[PDB]
Every structure is written in structure tokens, then in C-alpha cells.
Nucleic acid binder design. Structure first.
Ligand code: SF4
Length: 374
DNA sequence: TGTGATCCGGAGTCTGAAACA
DNA sequence: TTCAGACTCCGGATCAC
């Protein structure tokens, strides 16, 4: 019964990692998101070799330029994408990089889907056995294991665990451990889907925050006693702007879509009399984001572009008694957490927010963050 | 046959050199 | 002080020998 010890040692290590990151990085438990499965496949296409914020902004640009005229409904007109020339769809996702190659891959995927089934949809893939779905997804040109595992785990709710560069490095550095896939998949094949989802989410966030490739924050890492690099060893990055929290009954939020039932964070107002409103990411996207919105943090807000360009004149009486919270502006998640102490990261993730984007409400497209904020 | 390169590509940080002295 | 190149980012395909 060696496998009895094989699964027990990893389960104890995995649950210790999950419990510790719960206090530091907030609640990463599974919560459903809307959207179809073709959105997830295109997202995994767009996340090949690029940072997460760039890929998410590229998908937002795809949604904005091609708009729709767990509710499994398309947010993007994929028929128009297949109709659109490779040059224009490469222009849409230029900022992500590899625009032309990925545009051709996406057009080929959509064309093959139409040829196979006569319609761009993959809802029936949740009814087939998991292995058949994995083989069908692997049969596509431009998709490999790391992607199809992400698609299955985050969208099809199967039992899967993708091993990307961040996961492998963390596993090697910690007491754990295609070679990494062979070591981990048999040892991590029978666990609850919610547990796999939470582990994956906290692993990617931990790779972004504490355990980076260059100069990991080993001083403030909660896993110092369980690591090997720490065992063997022995600002312009972020701008903080204190803001006000706006209850949904406030007059300023009269025409702001009245949030979402499942959104865990409220609206914010960033005063410079004049203020800019910060719209939460889940509310701004109205759910319906690929891969269960694991591209954003739990405490992530956008910046209203119209409010940023022309701040709204507000009286000081309306915002007199509202509580005050930080936002920790910046340009990327890894940069704004560099050098931060454990208490600061915990406070930011539990009683704080994070903004690295600007959102245009009218066009639903990403915009660069304004100069004064960062 | 099993890696081992070389490609794709924008956007950012970060060094090292070439600079003040 | 300027400043350009290497490197990193939730990766596949195509040769080469
Ligand atoms: S101690 Fe350092 S190397 Fe180890 S897991 Fe933490 S950040 Fe990564």
C-alpha cells in the first residue's frame, strides 16, 4: 500500500499550503462564473506566452471590438471573428504579442469547429466522458496539454490539474517533487474539484506574489519552514491612493448597473471635491469571463475612463462618513507586491483593493491607466 | 527517438556600459 | 545622466541530426 502513503503525503502538504494562503491571500474558494466554453478555449489560446493582465486585456478588446448584440452565452461574436481578416483580429490583440500567429490559430480553430459541428459551440462537451473530451481538445492544432487541462479544470469542472511553468517551479522549490506532469498527475488524480480549483488559484497567485523566478520574497513568505531554496540559502512600483467606499444606495451610483449579486467588493471613489469611481472587475465584466475569471485577483477594481479624464464634481457632504481604504495602484501584480511585508499583503488582500487597469464603460474596452493615478 | 533548439511578438523591468564628475 | 539588449510572462509546432 505504498500509494496509500503517496497520496497521504501530498494531501497533507497541499492542504497546509491551502490553509496558509487562505489567511494571507483572502478567500480563493470556487465561485461560479458565466460564459460559454468556446470563450474558455479562446482564452487559453490567448494565454500561451504572455502575462495574465495582457491576455485578459486582449480578450476584453476582442469583446469590445466584436460585441454580443452560469448563463452559457457567448460574449464575443465568434462568427464575426471567423469572418474578420487575420490582419484586423491581429490588430485587436496586438498588445498581447504573437498577434498574427495566434489570430491564424483562432481562425483555424473556429473554422474546424464549424466544419465538425456546423456551429461554434461546445456545451455538449460537458456531457461526454472526461477522457473523450481531453482527446477531442488535444486533437486541435495549436493546443497541448497545459491548455486543455486548464480548459477542463476551470470550465468543464473535470478532475484535472495543469502544470504550467509557475506550478512546476513552485513544486520543485517546495518539498514536493512533461516529467513533472508524470510525477504529479498520478499523485493528484483523485481529489474534489473544488479542492483542485482552489489549489490551482492559490498556486498561481502565490507564484505571482511570493515565489517568483527572480528574487522571491522569501523574507515574507509564509512557507519558509517548508521550502528548499530558503532551507538551502541558510516606491515607483506601486502608488497608494486612499479612497472612499460607496454604498449601492449612493446617488453617484444611479447609472452604474447596480453591481452584481455575486460580487464580493463594493464601489470606490478616488478623490484628487473631484473624484474618480473605481468599478469592481466582476461587476464591470458582469461575470461572463473565461477560465472562471482567474485572470484577475479577488480584490481587483478597474478605473472608469470617463471619470478619469473628466472627474465628477461631488460635494463633500455625501462622502463625509464613508470609510476609507487603500487601492495600491500599479502596472502589474508582481511589481506592486515587491518588498511588501506579510502584514501589508494580508491587509491589502483582506481589507484592500488592487488596480492595474482602466476600463471604458461606453465601449467596454480596456484603456491605459491614467497618468496621475500611476 | 528524445530531447534541443529556433522560431512567434508586444510591453515591461533591469541591468551594463558609456556618461557626469 | 542616456540607452539598447537580455530576460520573463498561467506555451505549441517544426524542423535539425
Ligand atoms: S520561501 Fe522563497 S522559494 Fe520558498 S516558496 Fe517561499 S518565496 Fe518560494
Amino acid at each position: 500500500k505504498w500509494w496509500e502513503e503517496e497520496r497521504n503525503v501530498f494531501r497533507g502538504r497541499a492542504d497546509s499550503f491551502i490553509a496558509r494562503m487562505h489567511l494571507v491571500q483572502g478567500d480563493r474558494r470556487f465561485t461560479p462564473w458565466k460564459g460559454s466554453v468556446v470563450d474558455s478555449v479562446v482564452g487559453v489560446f490567448l494565454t500561451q506566452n504572455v502575462s495574465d493582465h495582457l491576455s485578459s486585456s486582449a480578450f476584453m478588446s476582442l469583446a469590445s471590438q466584436f460585441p454580443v448584440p452560469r448563463s452559457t452565452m457567448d460574449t464575443v461574436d465568434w462568427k464575426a471573428i471567423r469572418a474578420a481578416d487575420v490582419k484586423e483580429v491581429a490588430e485587436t490583440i496586438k498588445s498581447r504579442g504573437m498577434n498574427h500567429k495566434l489570430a491564424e490559430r483562432i481562425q483555424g480553430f473556429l473554422d474546424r469547429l464549424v466544419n465538425d459541428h456546423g456551429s461554434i459551440d461546445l456545451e455538449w462537451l460537458r456531457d461526454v466522458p472526461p477522457d473523450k473530451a481531453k482527446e477531442y481538445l488535444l486533437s486541435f492544432n495549436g493546443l497541448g496539454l497545459k491548455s486543455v487541462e486548464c480548459v477542463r479544470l476551470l470550465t468543464l469542472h473535470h478532475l484535472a490539474f495543469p502544470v504550467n511553468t509557475n506550478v512546476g517551479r513552485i513544486a520543485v522549490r517546495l518539498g514536493w517533487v512533461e516529467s513533472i506532469q508524470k510525477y504529479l498527475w498520478p499523485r493528484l488524480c483523485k481529489l474534489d474539484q473544488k479542492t483542485l480549483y482552489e489549489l490551482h488559484y492559490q498556486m498561481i497567485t502565490f507564484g505571482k506574489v511570493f515565489c517568483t523566478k527572480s528574487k522571491p520574497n522569501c523574507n515574507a513568505c509564509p512557507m519558509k519552514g517548508e521550502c528548499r531554496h530558503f532551507a538551502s540559502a541558510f516606491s515607483q512600483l506601486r502608488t497608494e491612493h486612499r479612497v472612499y467606499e460607496l454604498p449601492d444606495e449612493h446617488p453617484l451610483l444611479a447609472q452604474l448597473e447596480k453591481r452584481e449579486p455575486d460580487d464580493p467588493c463594493s464601489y470606490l471613489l478616488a478623490i484628487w471635491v473631484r473624484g474618480t469611481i473605481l468599478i469592481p472587475c466582476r461587476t464591470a465584466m458582469r461575470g461572463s469571463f473565461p477560465l472562471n475569471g482567474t485572470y484577475f485577483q479577488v480584490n481587483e477594481v478597474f478605473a472608469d475612463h470617463a471619470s478619469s479624464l473628466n472627474p465628477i464634481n461631488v460635494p463633500r457632504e455625501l462622502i463625509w462618513e464613508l470609510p476609507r481604504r487603500t487601492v495600491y495602484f500599479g502596472t502589474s501584480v508582481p511589481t506592486i507586491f515587491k518588498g511588501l511585508s506579510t502584514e501589508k499583503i494580508q491587509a491589502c488582500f483582506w481589507k484592500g483593493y488592487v488596480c492595474v487597469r482602466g476600463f471604458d464603460r461606453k465601449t467596454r474596452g480596456p484603456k491605459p491607466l491614467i497618468a496621475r493615478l500611476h
